[PDB]
Amino acid sequence: PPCLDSELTEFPLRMRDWLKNVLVTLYERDEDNNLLTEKQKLRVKKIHENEKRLEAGDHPVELLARDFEKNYNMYIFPVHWQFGQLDQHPIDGYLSHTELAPLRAPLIPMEHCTTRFFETCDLDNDKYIALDEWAGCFGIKQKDIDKDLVI
Ligand SMILES: [Ca+2]
Ligand SMILES: [Ca+2]
Ligand SMILES: [Ca+2]
Numbered sequence: 200p201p202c203l204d205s206e207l208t209e210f211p212l213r214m215r216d217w218l219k220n221v222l223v224t225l226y227e228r229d230e231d232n233n234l235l236t237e238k239q240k241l242r243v244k245k246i247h248e249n250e251k252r253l254e255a256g257d258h259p260v261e262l263l264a265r266d267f268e269k270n271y272n273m274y275i276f277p278v279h280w281q282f283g284q285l286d287q288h289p290i291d292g293y294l295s296h297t298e299l300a301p302l303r304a305p306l307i308p309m310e311h312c313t314t315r316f317f318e319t320c321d322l323d324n325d326k327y328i329a330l331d332e333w334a335g336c337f338g339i340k341q342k343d344i345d346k347d348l349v350i
Contacts, residue, residue, distance in 0.1 A: 211336065212267070214309075215267065215277070216253075219277045222280060243276070251270060252270070275343050276348055285301065286298060294328040296326065320336035322335075330346065331344055
Protein backbone atom coordinates (compact mmCIF):
# COMPACT_ATOMS: atom_id res chain seq x y z
CA PRO A 200 0.00 0.00 0.00
CA PRO A 201 1.07 3.51 -0.85
CA CYS A 202 2.47 5.70 1.90
CA LEU A 203 0.57 8.92 2.46
CA ASP A 204 2.53 12.09 3.28
CA SER A 205 0.50 12.13 6.47
CA GLU A 206 1.93 8.69 7.39
CA LEU A 207 5.44 9.57 6.26
CA THR A 208 5.49 12.36 8.88
CA GLU A 209 4.99 9.91 11.74
CA PHE A 210 7.34 7.22 10.43
CA PRO A 211 10.55 8.47 12.09
CA LEU A 212 8.84 8.98 15.52
CA ARG A 213 7.36 5.48 15.39
CA MET A 214 10.59 3.89 14.12
CA ARG A 215 12.77 5.59 16.74
CA ASP A 216 10.56 4.48 19.63
CA TRP A 217 10.42 0.94 18.20
CA LEU A 218 14.28 0.72 18.06
CA LYS A 219 14.62 1.93 21.62
CA ASN A 220 12.16 -0.72 22.77
CA VAL A 221 13.54 -3.61 20.71
CA LEU A 222 17.04 -2.89 22.06
CA VAL A 223 15.62 -3.03 25.62
CA THR A 224 14.10 -6.49 25.05
CA LEU A 225 17.44 -7.80 23.68
CA TYR A 226 19.12 -6.56 26.83
CA GLU A 227 16.55 -8.52 28.88
CA ARG A 228 16.69 -11.64 26.72
CA ASP A 229 20.50 -11.73 26.48
CA GLU A 230 22.31 -14.58 28.23
CA ASP A 231 26.13 -14.34 28.40
CA ASN A 232 26.28 -11.99 25.40
CA ASN A 233 24.55 -14.28 23.02
CA LEU A 234 22.57 -11.24 21.81
CA LEU A 235 24.56 -8.12 22.73
CA THR A 236 28.33 -7.74 23.05
CA GLU A 237 29.60 -6.61 26.42
CA LYS A 238 30.11 -2.98 25.27
CA GLN A 239 26.67 -2.74 23.69
CA LYS A 240 25.08 -4.39 26.73
CA LEU A 241 26.58 -1.95 29.15
CA ARG A 242 25.25 0.99 27.09
CA VAL A 243 21.74 -0.52 27.02
CA LYS A 244 21.76 -1.17 30.76
CA LYS A 245 21.89 2.56 31.44
CA ILE A 246 18.74 3.04 29.29
CA HIS A 247 16.93 0.14 30.90
CA GLU A 248 17.62 1.42 34.38
CA ASN A 249 16.58 4.97 33.63
CA GLU A 250 13.65 5.94 35.87
CA LYS A 251 12.40 8.43 33.28
CA ARG A 252 12.35 5.94 30.39
CA LEU A 253 8.98 5.92 28.53
CA GLU A 254 7.78 2.31 28.56
CA ALA A 255 6.41 0.57 25.45
CA GLY A 256 2.68 1.07 24.91
CA ASP A 257 0.23 2.69 22.50
CA HIS A 258 1.36 6.30 22.62
CA PRO A 259 -0.04 9.14 20.52
CA VAL A 260 2.64 10.63 18.31
CA GLU A 261 2.71 13.93 20.25
CA LEU A 262 3.77 12.02 23.38
CA LEU A 263 6.52 10.29 21.35
CA ALA A 264 7.67 13.70 20.09
CA ARG A 265 7.75 15.04 23.66
CA ASP A 266 9.80 12.14 24.98
CA PHE A 267 12.41 12.59 22.23
CA GLU A 268 12.73 16.23 23.32
CA LYS A 269 12.98 15.52 27.07
CA ASN A 270 14.89 12.25 26.79
CA TYR A 271 16.86 12.83 23.61
CA ASN A 272 19.92 11.32 25.23
CA MET A 273 18.49 7.77 25.40
CA TYR A 274 17.87 7.70 21.66
CA ILE A 275 21.45 8.32 20.58
CA PHE A 276 22.71 4.76 21.05
CA PRO A 277 19.61 2.98 19.68
CA VAL A 278 19.82 4.95 16.41
CA HIS A 279 23.55 4.17 16.00
CA TRP A 280 23.20 0.53 17.06
CA GLN A 281 20.61 -0.11 14.39
CA PHE A 282 22.86 1.27 11.63
CA GLY A 283 25.68 -1.01 12.81
CA GLN A 284 23.36 -4.00 12.60
CA LEU A 285 22.43 -3.37 8.99
CA ASP A 286 25.81 -2.31 7.57
CA GLN A 287 27.21 -5.71 6.80
CA HIS A 288 27.27 -6.42 3.11
CA PRO A 289 29.77 -5.02 2.93
CA ILE A 290 30.51 -3.05 6.08
CA ASP A 291 31.47 0.34 4.61
CA GLY A 292 29.53 3.07 6.48
CA TYR A 293 26.67 3.09 3.93
CA LEU A 294 23.37 1.20 3.67
CA SER A 295 22.32 -0.07 0.28
CA HIS A 296 18.73 -0.93 -0.66
CA THR A 297 19.53 -4.58 -0.01
CA GLU A 298 20.95 -3.92 3.40
CA LEU A 299 17.71 -2.08 4.28
CA ALA A 300 15.54 -5.14 3.56
CA PRO A 301 14.95 -6.06 7.25
CA LEU A 302 13.17 -2.73 7.69
CA ARG A 303 10.78 -3.61 4.87
CA ALA A 304 9.44 -6.67 6.75
CA PRO A 305 5.70 -6.85 7.81
CA LEU A 306 6.44 -6.63 11.47
CA ILE A 307 8.04 -3.19 11.19
CA PRO A 308 5.64 -0.41 12.04
CA MET A 309 4.52 1.42 8.87
CA GLU A 310 6.83 -0.78 6.86
CA HIS A 311 5.04 0.31 3.64
CA CYS A 312 6.64 3.74 4.24
CA THR A 313 10.24 2.49 4.59
CA THR A 314 11.42 2.94 1.04
CA ARG A 315 9.79 6.34 0.69
CA PHE A 316 11.27 7.52 3.99
CA PHE A 317 14.79 6.56 3.01
CA GLU A 318 14.64 8.21 -0.41
CA THR A 319 14.03 11.27 1.78
CA CYS A 320 17.22 10.77 3.85
CA ASP A 321 19.36 10.21 0.73
CA LEU A 322 20.53 13.80 0.44
CA ASP A 323 23.15 13.15 -2.24
CA ASN A 324 21.08 10.81 -4.37
CA ASP A 325 23.58 7.97 -4.61
CA LYS A 326 20.87 5.48 -3.50
CA TYR A 327 22.91 4.55 -0.39
CA ILE A 328 22.36 5.85 3.10
CA ALA A 329 25.52 7.15 4.83
CA LEU A 330 25.68 7.17 8.64
CA ASP A 331 25.29 10.92 8.76
CA GLU A 332 22.28 10.83 6.40
CA TRP A 333 20.82 8.12 8.70
CA ALA A 334 21.43 9.85 12.00
CA GLY A 335 20.23 13.17 10.59
CA CYS A 336 16.99 11.67 9.39
CA PHE A 337 16.25 10.33 12.87
CA GLY A 338 16.93 13.72 14.43
CA ILE A 339 20.32 13.04 16.01
CA LYS A 340 22.32 16.31 16.34
CA GLN A 341 25.50 16.64 14.28
CA LYS A 342 27.69 16.81 17.38
CA ASP A 343 26.34 13.48 18.62
CA ILE A 344 27.01 11.37 15.54
CA ASP A 345 29.84 8.98 16.44
CA LYS A 346 31.11 6.07 14.30
CA ASP A 347 32.28 4.41 17.55
CA LEU A 348 28.71 3.54 18.67
CA VAL A 349 28.20 1.66 15.39
CA ILE A 350 30.71 -1.02 16.43
CA1 LIG B 1 27.20 -1.34 3.79
CA1 LIG C 1 3.88 -3.65 9.88
CA1 LIG D 1 23.34 8.97 0.08
